[PDB]
Amino acid sequence: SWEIDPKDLTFLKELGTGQFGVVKYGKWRGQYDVAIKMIKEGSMSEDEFIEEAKVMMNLSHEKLVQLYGVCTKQRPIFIITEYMANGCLLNYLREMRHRFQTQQLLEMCKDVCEAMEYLESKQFLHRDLAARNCLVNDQGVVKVSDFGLSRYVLDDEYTSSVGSKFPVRWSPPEVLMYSKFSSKSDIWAFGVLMWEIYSLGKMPYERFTNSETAEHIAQGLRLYRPHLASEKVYTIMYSCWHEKADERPTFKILLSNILDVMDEES
Numbered sequence: 001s002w003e004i005d006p007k008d009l010t011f012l013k014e015l016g017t018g019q020f021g022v023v024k025y026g027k028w029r030g031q032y033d034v035a036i037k038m039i040k041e042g043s044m045s046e047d048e049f050i051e052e053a054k055v056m057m058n059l060s061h062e063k064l065v066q067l068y069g070v071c072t073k074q075r076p077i078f079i080i081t082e083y084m085a086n087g088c089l090l091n092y093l094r095e096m097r098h099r100f101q102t103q104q105l106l107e108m109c110k111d112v113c114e115a116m117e118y119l120e121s122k123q124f125l126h127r128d129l130a131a132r133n134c135l136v137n138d139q140g141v142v143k144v145s146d147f148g149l150s151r152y153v154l155d156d157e158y159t160s161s162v163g164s165k166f167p168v169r170w171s172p173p174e175v176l177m178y179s180k181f182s183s184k185s186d187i188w189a190f191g192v193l194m195w196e197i198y199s200l201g202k203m204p205y206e207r208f209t210n211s212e213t214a215e216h217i218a219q220g221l222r223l224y225r226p227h228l229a230s231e232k233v234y235t236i237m238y239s240c241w242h243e244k245a246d247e248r249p250t251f252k253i254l255l256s257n258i259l260d261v262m263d264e265e266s
């Protein structure tokens, strides 16, 4: 059920390179758009991923990038997913030509929140939620990508909290201090993602290094209100950054708050 025949794939364009190597755009059976991760040797705990891929196949939500299957008979292995024509959210936000309205920005937040509420309902952590790990389709809908895959990364620079590739700027204090991941670390990251959306893809804490950011958030420093964010929107993102993890909202509560603000500010 999980296996796709790689001979059914036609490779058309290169999309980029990430933690696991190259990702390509292609067609499945000459017809249907797909994205294809080509997993570089040494980059992934492959047997563990393949077992988990069976669980991931059952995760299905309109705002989650759909896993179609895997190709595991020969190396490199492929991961075949839904193709998102308008690319990575972070780049999309940074293209000033879009001149987003604040209603569109809130809708992007809601798209992600719906995906995350679904994952939370399945007790499934994303673990690296950020604009760089969201994608945009040809209709401008944002979807969440590569949920859970952090577990299978073999690179210590990514995994270690002091590693060069670790997502310090998306991490709550208890992750920076104790590497304590939970639903509530996804909540913190979601707040930073809201901030990224309303900041049109600026780097969080853009004037600090990772090391300085870690020290500052331990001391209680927070991101502050993006120019395009209303007070009501800012209240929602800020609620994600409570020092105490148990005082942070759930994704269901965030979704309810986002919907209320949409109704109030339209």
Ligand SMILES: Cc1c(-c2nc3nccc(-c4ccc5c(c4)CCC[C@@H]5NC(=O)c4nc(C(C)(C)C)no4)c3[nH]2)cnn1C(C)C
Pocket: 014, 015, 016, 017, 018, 019, 020, 021, 023, 035, 037, 081, 082, 083, 084, 085, 086, 087, 088, 128, 133, 135, 145, 146, 149, 150, 153
């Ligand atoms: C880029 C683009 C698209 C585009 N559509 C797409 N549809 C589906 C998937 C991708 C896709 C997803 C992810 C990645 C890329 C592409 C390329 C960069 C690396 C990135 N990340 C990982 O591969 C990766 N990261 C991880 C972590 C565990 C570290 C989170 N696991 O895998 C799509 N890209 C379309 N246009 N463009 C631009 C105008 C060229």
